[PDB]
Write an enzyme that holds these catalytic residues in place. Structure first.
Site, short mmCIF file in Angstrom:
data_model
loop_
_atom_site.label_atom_id
_atom_site.label_comp_id
_atom_site.label_asym_id
_atom_site.label_seq_id
_atom_site.Cartn_x
_atom_site.Cartn_y
_atom_site.Cartn_z
N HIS B 40 0.83 -1.20 0.00
CA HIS B 40 0.00 0.00 0.00
C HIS B 40 0.87 1.26 0.00
O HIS B 40 0.33 2.36 -0.11
CB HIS B 40 -0.96 -0.01 1.20
CG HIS B 40 -0.36 0.30 2.53
ND1 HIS B 40 0.01 -0.68 3.42
CD2 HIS B 40 -0.08 1.48 3.14
CE1 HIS B 40 0.50 -0.17 4.53
NE2 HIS B 40 0.44 1.13 4.35
N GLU B 52 19.78 7.47 6.94
CA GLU B 52 19.03 8.55 7.60
C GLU B 52 18.91 8.33 9.09
O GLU B 52 18.72 7.18 9.53
CB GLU B 52 17.59 8.66 7.08
CG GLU B 52 17.45 9.34 5.72
CD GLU B 52 17.63 10.85 5.75
OE1 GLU B 52 18.10 11.40 6.75
OE2 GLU B 52 17.27 11.51 4.75
N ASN B 54 18.25 11.61 11.33
CA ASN B 54 17.42 12.78 11.48
C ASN B 54 16.89 13.06 10.08
O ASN B 54 17.62 13.60 9.26
CB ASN B 54 18.25 13.98 12.01
CG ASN B 54 17.42 15.24 12.22
OD1 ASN B 54 16.50 15.55 11.46
ND2 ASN B 54 17.70 16.01 13.26
N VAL B 57 17.40 16.94 8.70
CA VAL B 57 18.72 17.58 8.64
C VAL B 57 19.62 16.72 7.76
O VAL B 57 19.60 15.51 7.97
CB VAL B 57 19.33 17.68 10.09
CG1 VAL B 57 20.76 18.19 10.03
CG2 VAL B 57 18.52 18.67 10.93
N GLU B 62 23.81 10.22 4.32
CA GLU B 62 22.70 9.79 3.49
C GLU B 62 23.09 9.42 2.07
O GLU B 62 23.99 10.04 1.50
CB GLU B 62 21.64 10.90 3.40
CG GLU B 62 21.08 11.36 4.73
CD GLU B 62 21.85 12.48 5.41
OE1 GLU B 62 23.00 12.81 5.06
OE2 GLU B 62 21.30 13.10 6.32
N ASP B 84 0.39 -7.72 1.69
CA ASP B 84 0.86 -6.34 1.67
C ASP B 84 2.41 -6.23 1.67
O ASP B 84 3.06 -5.97 2.69
CB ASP B 84 0.27 -5.60 2.88
CG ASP B 84 0.44 -4.10 2.79
OD1 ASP B 84 0.80 -3.55 1.73
OD2 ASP B 84 0.19 -3.40 3.78
N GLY B 175 2.76 6.68 9.16
CA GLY B 175 4.10 7.08 8.76
C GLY B 175 5.13 5.98 8.97
O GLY B 175 6.26 6.11 8.45
N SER B 177 4.35 2.68 8.14
CA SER B 177 4.08 1.67 7.11
C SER B 177 5.29 1.30 6.27
O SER B 177 6.03 2.20 5.86
CB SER B 177 3.02 2.13 6.14
OG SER B 177 1.80 1.73 6.73
N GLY B 178 5.44 0.00 6.03
CA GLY B 178 6.51 -0.47 5.17
C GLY B 178 7.81 -0.74 5.91
O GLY B 178 8.70 -1.42 5.39
CA CA Z 1 19.33 13.25 7.57
#
Ligand code: CA
Lengths: 28, 223
Positions: B40, B52, B54, B57, B62, B84, B175, B177-178
């Site tokens: 979904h 990641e 934060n 920022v 990253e 799913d 937020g 999900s997955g």
């Molecule tokens: Ca970051």
């Protein structure tokens, strides 16, 4: 209500997935 | 994640953020080119953000890589959320290093009572909304199949597990999900759905990853 845990903004309930409703601009 | 704690730096090196203008779902890196997430969370354009901590920022660890292939399970049902699970092939391989590492696919399904680690940048409030900059973590056990089915009568298929607390107060939320549920160092669940977040007798429901190991391997082998 079955509500997927995706982050999604909405203005109406219809914007959301499954049984999520639009609670203050986000689906939940 | 409601009722969790801010993950330490260097923790959860397999966590990714799926971004389409904003973070909207998590995922897990399972080899240098493939990410697993929830079907979904499908969007036609997805940027995967790795390393990641934060999300607000740029910390300098990253890697932002666009999704080249986005493959939802052939039997995903959007209404019931059965099957799913989605695979994403990165347009370029991630550099595996200190901060970016892969998590293993399960060698067996987890037994009830196994303690797991769930993580994500989702809502931290059951009532209201607070979306954290820092990745949140939660330790929670796999619930028995019977407790899960009695919490959600007629809605739990054989492809779903409940992880959490029947008492509520600690759970994944919008937020998340997955994202990953890792138990004994193996990916056993994918954040999928629930009724509200952290409510009494409504634990989170997660895709049961040990049912899909052959589909994942075959899909990676074919693409
Ligand atoms: Ca970051």
């Amino acid at each position: 209500r079955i509500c997927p845990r995706i982050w999604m903004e909405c203005t109406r309930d219809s914007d959301c997935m499954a049984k999520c409703i639009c609670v203050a601009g986000h689906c939940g | 994640i409601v009722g969790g704690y801010t993950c330490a730096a260097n923790s959860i090196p397999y966590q990714v953020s799926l971004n389409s203008g904003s973070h909207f779902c998590g995922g897990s890196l399972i080899n240098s080119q493939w990410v697993v997430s929830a079907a979904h969370c499908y969007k036609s354009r997805i940027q995967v953000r790795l390393g990641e901590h934060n999300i607000d920022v740029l910390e300098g660890n990253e890697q932002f890589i666009n999704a080249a292939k986005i493959i939802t399970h052939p039997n995903f049902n959007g209404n019931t959320l059965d099957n799913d699970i989605m695979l994403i092939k990165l347009s370029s391989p991630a550099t595996l290093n200190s901060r970016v590492a892969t998590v293993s696919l399960p060698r067996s399904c987890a037994a009830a009572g196994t303690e797991c680690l769930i993580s994500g940048w989702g809502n931290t409030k059951s009532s209201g909304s607070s979306y954290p900059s820092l990745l949140q973590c939660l330790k929670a056990p796999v619930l028995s199949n019977s407790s899960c089915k009695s919490s959600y009568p007629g809605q739990i298929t054989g492809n779903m597990i409940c992880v959490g607390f029947l008492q509520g107060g600690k759970d994944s939320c919008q937020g998340d999900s997955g994202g990953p549920v890792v138990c004994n160092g193996q990916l056993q669940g994918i954040v999928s759905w629930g009724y509200g977040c952290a409510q009494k007798n409504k634990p989170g429901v997660y895709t049961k990853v040990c049912n899909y190991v052959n589909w994942i391997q075959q899909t990676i082998a074919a693409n």
